[PDB]
Amino acid sequence: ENIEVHMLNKGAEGAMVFEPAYIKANPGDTVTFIPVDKGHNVESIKDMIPEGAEKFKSKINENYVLTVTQPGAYLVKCTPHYAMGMIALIAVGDSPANLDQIVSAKKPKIVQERLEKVIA
Ligand SMILES: [Co+2]
């Protein structure tokens, strides 16, 4: 199945957001990232995707379709706005093995706050 995500300058959680910022998926699903506002992209964060998953980075302002294969958690960022909190968490399958690791990993404060919200 397909899950659509909007990339926005402003949304419910404040400035520079993915909506939704929590995406539940299964292997073989697609996540479609739509640049509703300009100035955004999607990029996998180093050491915060499952072992065996391929790294990815879209171009600024492109519609990007991600196919997810490996189970686990994926933290993705908008490259220009990572420091402003623009992230999403994709959970593929049940009980992602690397979720606690991602929560503990070094990242900007605003990112950590937003991440803890989405998990909660
Ligand atoms: Co952005």
Side-chain angles (χ1 to χ4, degrees):
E1 95 171 13
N2 181 54
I3 301 106
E4 168 177 325
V5 179
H6 291 191
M7 304 189 282
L8 297 155
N9 289 343
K10 196 280 183 282
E13 292 298 324
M16 300 313 172
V17 295
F18 287 97
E19 291 192 338
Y22 181 70
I23 294 107
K24 177 69 220 332
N26 286 296
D29 288 342
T30 56
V31 187
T32 298
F33 294 92
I34 299 172
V36 170
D37 296 324
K38 304 200 163 165
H40 309 291
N41 76 329
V42 70
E43 180 178 4
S44 52
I45 296 167
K46 181 183 164 197
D47 205 41
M48 302 191 204
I49 63 171
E51 276 217 327
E54 303 203 301
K55 304 305 288 158
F56 51 91
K57 183 180 184 196
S58 69
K59 39 221 160 158
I60 300 192
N61 300 327
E62 88 163 298
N63 265 48
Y64 184 72
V65 181
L66 172 66
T67 305
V68 285
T69 297
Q70 297 297 323
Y74 298 65
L75 200 67
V76 304
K77 65 178 171 171
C78 175
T79 308
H81 301 126
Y82 180 49
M84 305 175 186
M86 192 157 176
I87 51 113
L89 177 71
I90 306 169
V92 178
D94 295 319
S95 212
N98 62 333
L99 180 61
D100 291 324
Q101 174 259 315
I102 287 170
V103 172
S104 291
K106 185 178 187 198
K107 56 191 91 65
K109 187 167 180 182
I110 176 47
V111 171
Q112 190 70 22
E113 294 179 1
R114 284 178 174 190
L115 175 55
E116 285 177 10
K117 288 193 212 80
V118 298
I119 286 171

